[PDB]
């Protein structure tokens, strides 16, 4: 038996796509964890921000990305693959807005990313893009906060709360154990950052984490400035 199953995205004798799972491992090689919590009133994604040098410009070390003005994408994984998926998601959103005339929903963008990961996991000549993508944002047609997570396999699912990265398992456990229908965007952000801080085991400072708290007042995607993140972290430390 040839070894194509372990080097290319073809099924092994166990019917597993080894390269897809290795792209999951490559996602975990990002060394960062992202926790996204989507409440009725807000969606907060907090991804711990690790800069390896003091000589790297921190503003360039990001996992939050503007896909559209509305849709944000917290991409965890290989930085080259993260950049590729950022530009691919932006191209998907642009093509969708051009063909359909309106900004891409988070759900459709998640499905398009899932299709890209399916063509990577089916086309043997295309690598699975080692990116776990937490797409999020206020869908206007439903006026509700969409939060989809697309795996490197392309497994896309909407989430009330999701996690990605190294502590994805622990973060998911904490989310599904302590999740609530938070009444305020501040509550959603506090829970997101508290879950991320707990699973990471390190008390965070605003510089150490990127937070995007999309609310109905501010539905446009944007990384929260370090002052708002610091206020959220203080609220977390308040309890």
């Amino acid at each position: 038996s040839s070894g194509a199953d372990r080097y290319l995205t073809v099924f092994s004798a166990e019917g597993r796509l080894w390269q897809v799972e290795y792209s999951f491992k490559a996602v975990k090689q990002a060394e960062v964890t992202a926790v996204a919590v989507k409440s009725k009133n807000a969606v907060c994604v907090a991804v711990q921000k690790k800069v390896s040098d003091k000589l790297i410009d921190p503003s360039t070390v990001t996992h939050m990305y503007r896909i559209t003005d509305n849709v944000g994408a917290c991409l965890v994984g290989l930085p080259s693959d993260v950049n590729f998926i950022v530009m691919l998601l932006r191209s998907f959103a642009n093509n969708f807005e051009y063909k359909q005339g309106f900004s891409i929903p988070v759900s459709i963008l998640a499905q398009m990313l899932s299709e890209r990961h399916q063509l990577e996991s089916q086309l043997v000549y295309v690598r699975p893009s080692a990116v776990s993508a937490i797409l999020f944002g206020l869908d206007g047609p439903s006026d509700s906060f969409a939060l989809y997570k697309i795996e490197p396999s392309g497994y896309s699912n909407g989430f009330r709360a999701v996690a990605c990265g190294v502590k994805e398992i622990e973060a998911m456990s904490a989310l599904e154990k302590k999740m609530e229908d938070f009444e305020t965007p501040e509550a959603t952000a506090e829970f997101t950052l508290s879950t991320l801080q707990t699973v990471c085991g390190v008390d965070f400072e605003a510089q150490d984490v990127e937070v995007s708290l999309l609310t109905r007042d501010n539905s446009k995607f944007s990384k929260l400035p370090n002052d708002k993140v610091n206020e959220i972290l203080h609220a977390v430390a308040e309890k």
């Binding site: 932006r90 191209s91 642009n94 005339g101």
Partner: protein
């Protein structure tokens, strides 16, 4: 059509009529000829509604493409919009018969770029286009002031587009105004009842 984009000190005032003309018929008398490319990028459209709407659609597409690989989404966006409209008018010069005044606000401040039907993109502080703009040229020349604020430029633009409306059959209806400053764009509609003057200024 009448289009009049004024780059003021504190913003851009893009005025237009609302009359789409199909011969002597007005298929759309409440036409919004100033298309919102982005919250602070607007395209006042003159010429074939299909062609100019395709230009607005394609410049939105090209501005999103410009933002695929960058995070400074607010940089050179008016200038890139004008360059893209110019490139599309030149590329589809045979097909497209469209002139776009792309005005608005970006990181570089308030900017108006008139891309003529020829595909000639020029940065202007006072750009006018359309069959109606002709009738107001002297008016603009004698009533435009480089120091006009966005309020003063808005009043002047309403008056000029009203004159073009009155004198131009192809221009008519309401004056669609877009005031784009750093804070965003405000749309106003000056219906014929609210316009400074009407047909009665003709010979009187």
């Amino acid at each position: 059509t009448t289009l009049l984009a004024i780059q003021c000190t504190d913003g851009v005032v893009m005025a237009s009529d609302s009359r789409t003309s199909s011969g002597s018929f007005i298929p759309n008398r409440a036409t919004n000829k100033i298309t919102e490319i982005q919250p602070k990028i607007f395209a006042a459209r003159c010429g074939n509604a299909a062609d100019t709407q395709f230009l607005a659609r394609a410049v939105k597409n090209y501005l999103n493409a410009l933002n695929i690989t960058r995070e400074n989404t607010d940089d050179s966006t008016i200038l890139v919009a004008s360059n893209v409209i110019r490139s599309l008018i030149v590329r589809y010069r045979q097909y497209l018969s469209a002139g776009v005044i792309v005005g608005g606000w970006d990181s570089a401040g308030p900017q108006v770029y008139s891309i003529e039907v020829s595909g000639m993109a020029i940065k202007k502080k006072i750009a006018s286009n359309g069959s109606g703009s002709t009738y107001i040229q002297a008016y603009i020349d004698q009533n435009y002031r480089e120091d006009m604020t966005m309020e003063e430029a808005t009043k002047f633009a309403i008056a000029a587009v009203t004159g073009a409306i009155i004198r131009d059959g192809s221009s008519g209806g309401v004056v669609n105004i877009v005031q784009i400053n750093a804070d965003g764009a405000k749309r106003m509609t000056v219906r014929p009842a609210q316009q400074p003057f009407n047909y009665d200024i003709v010979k009187g």
